[PDB]
Every structure is written in structure tokens, then in C-alpha cells.
Write a protein that binds this ligand. Structure first.
Ligand SMILES: CCCCCCCCCCCCCC(=O)SCCNC(=O)CCNC(=O)[C@H](O)C(C)(C)COP(=O)(O)OP(=O)(O)OC[C@H]1O[C@@H](n2cnc3c(N)ncnc32)[C@H](O)[C@@H]1OP(=O)(O)O
Ligand SMILES: [Cl-]
Lengths: 7, 392
């Protein structure tokens, strides 16, 4: 539901 | 949109102010509906802009399923910098959209009248939800999508109102959903974390890049994994395991404040392994007793505008239940299994007890918050570690 990638 | 609570404080929500949700600003000290159940429901579908029509999608029609795949593959959620887009497969969509109790009218599409092109979608599936001391029949809302050429034209508020109407017609008045944007009003805020499995690929596609200061060599060695899991008696879930997986999950989830309440049929649907959709492994011990299980689902993404790498293969932590095997050992085996199956990255939220293993297993914190929301239900917010609910 929400596309994350490493901070 | 507003992705932080900062940019959201500075916004006015013309649509969400009309809806039975709490205000962003207020803080909640009560438990219960925002408004009473309606005993008469609008019979007519809401009006769409001229040239568009409602169409309920029969996903049993392979051609219709493919139209939905294409709409989502081209227009659904992207990362913050427009580098990756979710690429839900057709078979995954069938899994997520036809659980027990699914209704065809809750697969709510929008089409162009002339061309019949699918340009909008929203869905609802029924679920029993345990929220603090209350259990409610609800729907889960998923896959809200408006074609890119049709955006910023109020189509999304109409899709929300129309699925609300169709859910009300069936006597359900609460819903649960998630989003990467901040809206009135999150019941909990979770953070995605990422575990590199194929760090080479992840860096050449700029999903991640080298921590300072580290070589590609150090980075690979840091993320290497065993070639086989370590836990004794780990094996794929089978039909005979459905009751005990149901029992384990039910007891494990009682310790959290927002959870699903699954029937045994729903347990079979959500956990019985399907290649390229959902993987579930149980621990059968030396006495033949199933004492733990781990699960993760398959959700790849399109890599946009890239000449050589077209897709990222992501695994997502689903539900992990431990009663004898340490959670850390369970999740370490999940990483190994994902690596074996060809996944490039393993994603997990910081909900349930995941914070106890994320850093130790070398997850890196992501840039994405996943907000959890209830519709027409007022209750105190909770910390991520009390959220015991995972959606697709
Ligand atoms: C009882 C049953 C009840 C069931 C209903 C329960 C509620 C379900 C609610 C939906 C749960 C979905 C769960 C999932 O699937 S979360 C996934 C959301 N999907 C995507 O992000 C796919 C890619 N994006 C899109 O396709 C479009 O940007 C969307 C579809 C978002 C339209 O976007 P567009 O740019 O064309 O906007 P507009 O001009 O049409 O309309 C603007 C209004 O839309 C509000 N908005 C924007 N994004 C979201 C969002 N993600 N959730 C809820 N509301 C959202 C926005 O704040 C504004 O309201 P306000 O700012 O004026 O107040
Ligand atoms: Cl269907």
C-alpha cells in the first residue's frame, strides 16, 4: 500500500 | 498529498471534513462510532463526470482481470521520487480481492463510456476487526486508483463515496484502510524497513546505495545469508496444518489492539501457500506438534525508465507467530527462504513485535510511513507495536 525505500 | 504530519497540519481537508472520521487536530478519549448506523441508504450510484460510467469488475473474466492489472501496473502507488511502482500480478489480485465473503459489486470500477477503457478502481472486502475491547464486522478498502490523465479532477472522492454506499447497502458501517499519505486521522503510524538480499541489484537501480563509508565488497559480505534455514522442522504449510495455524494466530494476536479475527476458512485463504503470492512455513517439532509459523507475500515492483533492470522482486512480512522458536530465529529463516526464492529485498513494518528483530537482522529504515485508519470509529491512537494487522 505505500512504496518505501531505505531512508 | 501530505506525507508528513508537518505538511498535514498546514492543510485543509475539504473532503475528509465531510466524512465520519476524527479531525487531525483533536485527540480521542472515547471508543465508538462517529455516527450511527444509517437505516435508509441512497439507492442511486453517485454521479460521475460526463463520459464515464460505473462498472463492477468480474475478476473471474480473465480479460477483465487483465484490464485491472494494467490499470494498476500503470497508475497505482509509486515511491516518493517516481522511480518504482507496485506491480501486483493478476493472480495476487484474485487472492486479495476474492477472500471469503467477497462481493462483485465491491470491485468498483470506472470506465470511459466510448472506449470502455478502465480508468478508475476501488475495492472492499469484508473482515472481522478487533479494535481494543470491541469486535466489529468491517470492510478493508484497497486498490484506490485513478488513471494518471484523470487525476486532480475529484474522481477519488466519488470512488470513496460510491464504495461507502455499496458497503452501507450490505449493513456494514466501519472500515479499515492504510495509506502513505496523512489523512484525518491515523489510528497508528508504522514505518517500512528493508532487508537487502541482492544488494548489487538494489544499488544499480538506486533502490538503496552504498552507506558511507563502505565498498560494494563490504556491502555484499555484510548481507550474505546462509544457504539453508536453521530451525528444526521448518517446512511449507499443508492442508493438515490449517486448524493449528488458525489456533496459533488467534492466540498470538490477542496481545495487540488492532487485529483481524479470522475464521478457519479465512486462515486457509490468507495463508495456504500459492506460488508467487503467499508463502507460509510451519515449525513441526520432534513430537509432531506445529508450534510456530512464518509467512510473507510476493509483491514485485516496476523499475521505471531503466534500460536493463525492469523489476524489483520484493517479499513482504505477513504474520509471524512464535511460541517455541525465537522470533529472531524465525525471521532469520524467513530471510534465507526469501533469498532462496529469488527475492531482491525483504520488507517488514515496525508493527507487532518486529522492532525486536529489525536492527539485529540488518534491516534499514525506509522513507515510507504507512498510516492506519478506521472509518466511522473513534478510539485512541496506538503505537506501532500494538498494531496487529497486515494488508496487501
Ligand atoms: C463503510 C465503508 C467505508 C469505506 C470507505 C472508507 C474510506 C476509504 C478511503 C480511501 C482509502 C484507500 C486505501 C488505499 O487504497 S491507499 C492507496 C491509494 N492509491 C494510490 O495512491 C494510487 C496512486 N494514486 C492515485 O491513483 C490517485 O492519486 C488517487 C486515487 C489517490 C486519486 O488522487 P487525486 O490526486 O486524483 O485526488 P482527487 O483530486 O481525485 O481527490 C483529492 C482528495 O483525495 C484525497 N486522497 C488522496 N489520496 C488518498 C488516499 N490515498 N486515500 C484516501 N484519500 C486520498 C485527498 O486528500 C483529497 O481530499 P481532501 O484533501 O480534499 O480532503
Ligand atoms: Cl469478481
Amino acid at each position: 500500500x505505500c512504496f518505501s525505500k531505505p531512508r | 498529498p501530505a506525507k508528513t504530519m508537518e505538511e498535514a497540519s498546514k492543510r485543509s481537508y475539504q473532503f475528509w471534513d465531510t466524512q465520519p472520521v476524527p479531525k487531525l487536530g483533536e485527540v480521542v478519549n472515547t471508543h465508538g462510532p462517529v455516527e450511527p448506523d444509517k437505516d435508509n441508504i441512497r439507492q442511486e450510484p453517485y454521479t460521475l463526470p460526463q463520459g464515464f460510467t460505473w462498472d463492477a469488475l468480474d475478476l473471474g473474466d480473465r480479460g477483465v482481470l487483465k484490464e485491472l492489472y494494467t490499470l494498476l501496473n500503470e497508475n497505482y502507488v509509486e515511491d516518493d521520487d517516481n522511480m518504482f511502482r507496485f506491480d501486483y500480478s493478476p493472480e495476487f489480485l484474485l487472492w486479495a480481492l476474492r477472500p471469503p465473503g467477497w462481493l462483485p459489486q465491491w470491485h468498483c470500477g470506472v470506465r470511459v463510456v466510448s472506449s470502455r477503457k478502465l480508468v478508475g478502481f476501488i475495492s472492499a472486502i469484508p473482515a472481522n476487526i478487533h479494535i481494543y475491547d470491541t469486535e466489529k464486522k468491517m470492510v478493508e478498502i484497497n486498490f484506490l486508483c485513478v488513471h494518471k490523465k484523470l487525476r486532480s479532477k475529484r474522481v477519488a472522492p466519488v470512488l470513496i463515496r460510491e464504495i461507502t454506499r455499496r458497503v452501507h447497502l450490505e449493513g456494514i458501517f466501519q472500515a479499515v484502510y492504510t495509506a502513505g499519505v496523512v489523512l484525518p486521522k491515523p489510528v497508528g503510524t508504522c514505518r517500512y524497513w528493508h532487508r537487502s538480499l541482492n544488494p548489487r541489484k538494489l544499488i544499480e537501480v538506486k533502490f538503496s546505495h552504498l552507506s558511507r563509508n563502505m565498498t560494494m565488497q563490504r556491502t555484499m559480505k555484510l548481507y550474505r545469508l546462509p544457504e539453508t534455514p536453521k530451525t528444526a522442522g521448518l517446512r511449507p504449510m499443508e492442508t493438515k496444518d490449517i486448524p493449528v495455524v488458525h489456533q496459533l494466530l488467534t492466540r498470538y494476536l490477542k496481545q495487540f489492539h488492532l487485529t483481524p479475527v479470522m475464521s478457519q476458512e479465512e486462515v486457509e485463504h490468507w495463508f495456504y501457500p500459492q506460488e508467487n503470492i503467499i508463502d507460509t512455513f510451519v515449525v513441526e517439532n520432534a513430537n509432531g506438534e506445529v508450534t510456530d509459523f512464518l509467512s510473507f507475500y510476493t509483491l514485485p515492483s516496476t523499475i521505471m525508465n531503466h534500460p536493463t533492470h525492469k523489476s524489483l522482486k520484493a517479499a513482504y512480512s505477513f504474520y509471524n507467530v512464535h511460541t517455541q522458536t525465537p522470533l529472531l530465529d524465525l525471521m532469520s529463516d524467513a530471510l534465507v527462504l526469501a533469498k532462496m526464492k529469488g527475492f531482491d529485498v525483504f520488507n517488514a513494518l515496525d508493527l507487532m513485535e518486529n522492532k525486536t528483530f529489525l536492527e539485529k537482522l540488518k534491516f534499514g529504515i525506509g522513507d515510507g510511513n504507512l498510516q492506519y485508519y478506521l472509518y466511522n470509529w473513534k478510539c485512541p491512537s496506538m503505537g506501532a507495536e500494538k498494531v496487529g494487522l497486515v494488508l496487501q
